Amino acid sequence: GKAFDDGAFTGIREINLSYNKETAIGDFQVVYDLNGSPYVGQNHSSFISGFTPVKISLDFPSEYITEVSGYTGNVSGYVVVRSLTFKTNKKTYGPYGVTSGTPFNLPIENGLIVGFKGSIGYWMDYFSMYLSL
Amino acid sequence: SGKSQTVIVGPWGAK
Ligand SMILES: CO[C@H]1O[C@H](CO)[C@H](O)[C@H](O)[C@H]1O
């Protein structure tokens, strides 16, 4: 898949992703906060189509992610991220995609997600998060 | 180096 790396910013304002209830997560794009103004991250699109778009609009900076969780699993021979859930201090968004495979979860007691990197081919292959205080 | 760094956790997914 094509690797991407957004880098670290001052917070997150909005997450736009797309999924398919049979396969996995497809498109991924973030609107970050950069010192009080939105910074539109580059769109990281799947190599194919047919996904259902989702827009996760956060009331920044009062609302911020306190936990990211999801499932990784095999899709057509590839281990990919089949599902993602974003929990804030205000609400829970997801799960999006298929909740089967091996679960993972990152509850944050102190700190903030300020950035994402990973890889998307047909589906999201993997992904990492930047953390800071 | 002249680039700041941050904690990074992951990746989850393909190896
Ligand atoms: C169908 O193959 C494409 O997608 C898979 C799963 O996303 C991997 O990214 C692979 O490298 C890419 O060629």
A26 closest CA partner among A5, A4, A51? A51
Q: Out of 1.10.1740.110, 2.100.10.30, 2.160.10.10, 3.30.70.660, select the CATH number for domain A1-133.
A: 2.100.10.30
Give yes or no for a contact between A132 and A114, defined as CB atoms under 8 angstroms apart.
Answer: yes
Resolution reading in Å? 2.5
Structure determination technique employed: X-ray
Give the domain ranges of chain A: 1-133
B14 vs A79: CB contact, 8 Å cut-off?
yes
Instruction: Nearest by CB to A118, from B4, B9, B11: name it.
Output: B11
Give yes or no for a contact between A98 and A53, defined as CB atoms under 8 angstroms apart.
Answer: no
Give yes or no for a contact between A18 and A52, defined as CB atoms under 8 angstroms apart.
Answer: yes
A6 closest CA partner among A29, A36, A27? A29
